Amino acid sequence: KLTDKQKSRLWELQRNRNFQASRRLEGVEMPLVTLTAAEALARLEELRSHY
Amino acid sequence: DPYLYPLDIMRNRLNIHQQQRLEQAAYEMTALRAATIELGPLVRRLPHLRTIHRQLYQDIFDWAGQLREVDIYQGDTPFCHFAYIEKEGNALMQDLEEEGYLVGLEKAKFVERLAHYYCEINVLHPFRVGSGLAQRIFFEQLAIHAGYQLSWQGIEKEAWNQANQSGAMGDLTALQMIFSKVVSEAGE
Ligand SMILES: [Cl-]
Ligand SMILES: [Cl-]
Ligand SMILES: [Cl-]
């Protein structure tokens, strides 16, 4: 994954898995987020409205 | 604590007044924000680490991205004194930059340097909440720029915290052992 586009694709493929596992190191079990970045932004907007 | 309302609860942007509900909202919102974080640059100093934290916490805290302003303990062990964070953080990032962000290294050497830098940043604990999360994203991205990839899967929390503590006291053996497992070749 030497190319900028290859590195970015790797990052996108792993970032959510990583955050789940990362949070587990803090002792918290959370479900895996499978949303795309755009979907996550739209869901964040709903959650802000909800609070 | 200046981060608390003048109660049991940290001041927050969501007008939540119950600590447990704030915790849960943070777990959910940080996880959605982490789904939007891009790889970022090869050249990464303290401002890039602050940007990760800002990204994660921008919905929750006005202070997202800002350095910690109080002292924090894990048990009886203090993290870096707050007034020293900027000086120590900058110095550490400068050492990292002089090592070219760990690029061009064979696996054993990468693991060794990574454990070292991970240990140093962990003691720094630059943010009031979420330091661990921001630090790990910073290093996950760094690894990919360096031709490696990190997985935190299957690392036990107790082993993780003990490894970091031993490392901060001068024996990086346990943290390097964890990193030998966490690290694999990029795209492998
Ligand atoms: Cl509430
Ligand atoms: Cl959190
Ligand atoms: Cl930077």
mmCIF file of N, CA and C in Angstrom, chain B residues 5 7 9 12 34 37 39 50 52 56 59-60 82 88-89 96 99 108 110 119 132-133 137 158 162 164 171 174 184:
data_model
loop_
_atom_site.group_PDB
_atom_site.id
_atom_site.type_symbol
_atom_site.label_atom_id
_atom_site.label_comp_id
_atom_site.label_asym_id
_atom_site.label_seq_id
_atom_site.Cartn_x
_atom_site.Cartn_y
_atom_site.Cartn_z
ATOM 1 N N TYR B 5 -19.362 21.349 35.656
ATOM 2 C CA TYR B 5 -20.263 22.495 35.892
ATOM 3 C C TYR B 5 -20.011 22.967 37.378
ATOM 4 N N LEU B 7 -21.073 19.662 38.377
ATOM 5 C CA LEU B 7 -21.585 18.920 39.543
ATOM 6 C C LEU B 7 -20.926 17.513 39.734
ATOM 7 N N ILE B 9 -20.863 16.258 36.775
ATOM 8 C CA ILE B 9 -20.946 16.210 35.287
ATOM 9 C C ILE B 9 -20.074 17.227 34.637
ATOM 10 N N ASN B 12 -20.746 20.264 28.839
ATOM 11 C CA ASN B 12 -20.835 19.676 27.522
ATOM 12 C C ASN B 12 -21.824 20.398 26.657
ATOM 13 N N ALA B 34 -15.192 8.913 14.318
ATOM 14 C CA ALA B 34 -13.981 8.157 13.892
ATOM 15 C C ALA B 34 -14.162 7.557 12.516
ATOM 16 N N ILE B 37 -12.732 10.313 9.963
ATOM 17 C CA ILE B 37 -11.355 10.786 10.070
ATOM 18 C C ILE B 37 -10.561 10.244 8.900
ATOM 19 N N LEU B 39 -6.872 9.725 6.699
ATOM 20 C CA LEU B 39 -5.498 9.243 7.051
ATOM 21 C C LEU B 39 -4.585 10.325 7.602
ATOM 22 N N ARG B 50 -3.827 17.072 17.941
ATOM 23 C CA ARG B 50 -4.922 17.906 18.402
ATOM 24 C C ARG B 50 -6.097 17.901 17.439
ATOM 25 N N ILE B 52 -7.030 15.378 15.513
ATOM 26 C CA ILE B 52 -7.755 14.100 15.752
ATOM 27 C C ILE B 52 -8.708 14.207 16.915
ATOM 28 N N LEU B 56 -12.868 14.016 16.886
ATOM 29 C CA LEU B 56 -13.616 13.067 17.741
ATOM 30 C C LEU B 56 -14.653 13.707 18.681
ATOM 31 N N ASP B 59 -18.534 17.504 18.842
ATOM 32 C CA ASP B 59 -19.971 17.548 19.173
ATOM 33 C C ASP B 59 -20.186 17.586 20.680
ATOM 34 N N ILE B 60 -19.188 17.206 21.469
ATOM 35 C CA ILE B 60 -19.391 16.944 22.907
ATOM 36 C C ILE B 60 -18.863 18.097 23.804
ATOM 37 N N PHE B 82 0.272 19.240 33.694
ATOM 38 C CA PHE B 82 -0.451 19.926 32.578
ATOM 39 C C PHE B 82 0.334 21.071 31.962
ATOM 40 N N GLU B 88 6.811 19.093 26.495
ATOM 41 C CA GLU B 88 7.123 17.675 26.343
ATOM 42 C C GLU B 88 6.570 17.078 25.055
ATOM 43 N N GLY B 89 5.351 17.478 24.674
ATOM 44 C CA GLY B 89 4.739 17.018 23.435
ATOM 45 C C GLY B 89 5.501 17.464 22.201
ATOM 46 N N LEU B 96 10.433 12.294 16.926
ATOM 47 C CA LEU B 96 9.760 11.492 15.914
ATOM 48 C C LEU B 96 10.047 11.966 14.518
ATOM 49 N N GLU B 99 13.367 11.031 13.381
ATOM 50 C CA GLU B 99 13.453 9.671 12.931
ATOM 51 C C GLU B 99 12.587 9.458 11.721
ATOM 52 N N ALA B 108 11.261 -5.443 13.279
ATOM 53 C CA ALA B 108 11.721 -5.402 14.663
ATOM 54 C C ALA B 108 12.045 -3.990 15.114
ATOM 55 N N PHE B 110 10.890 -1.095 13.833
ATOM 56 C CA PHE B 110 9.626 -0.323 13.837
ATOM 57 C C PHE B 110 8.873 -0.563 15.145
ATOM 58 N N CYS B 119 4.660 4.682 24.389
ATOM 59 C CA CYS B 119 4.844 4.823 25.846
ATOM 60 C C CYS B 119 4.991 6.302 26.324
ATOM 61 N N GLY B 132 -6.180 8.485 25.104
ATOM 62 C CA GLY B 132 -5.896 7.134 24.545
ATOM 63 C C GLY B 132 -6.386 6.928 23.102
ATOM 64 N N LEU B 133 -7.615 7.353 22.868
ATOM 65 C CA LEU B 133 -8.256 7.169 21.581
ATOM 66 C C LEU B 133 -7.526 7.976 20.515
ATOM 67 N N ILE B 137 -5.247 6.567 17.217
ATOM 68 C CA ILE B 137 -5.492 6.963 15.823
ATOM 69 C C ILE B 137 -4.233 7.555 15.202
ATOM 70 N N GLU B 158 -5.961 -5.184 30.808
ATOM 71 C CA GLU B 158 -5.091 -5.274 31.952
ATOM 72 C C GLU B 158 -3.625 -5.409 31.499
ATOM 73 N N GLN B 162 -0.790 -2.545 32.088
ATOM 74 C CA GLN B 162 0.431 -2.957 32.827
ATOM 75 C C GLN B 162 1.659 -2.726 31.963
ATOM 76 N N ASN B 164 2.034 -0.477 29.524
ATOM 77 C CA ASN B 164 2.304 0.958 29.492
ATOM 78 C C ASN B 164 2.969 1.498 30.769
ATOM 79 N N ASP B 171 10.940 -0.260 31.636
ATOM 80 C CA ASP B 171 11.007 -1.561 30.996
ATOM 81 C C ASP B 171 9.907 -1.667 29.976
ATOM 82 N N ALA B 174 7.259 -5.576 27.971
ATOM 83 C CA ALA B 174 5.879 -5.940 27.790
ATOM 84 C C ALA B 174 5.157 -5.167 26.679
ATOM 85 N N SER B 184 1.480 -5.523 11.781
ATOM 86 C CA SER B 184 1.788 -6.375 10.608
ATOM 87 C C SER B 184 2.096 -5.491 9.433
#
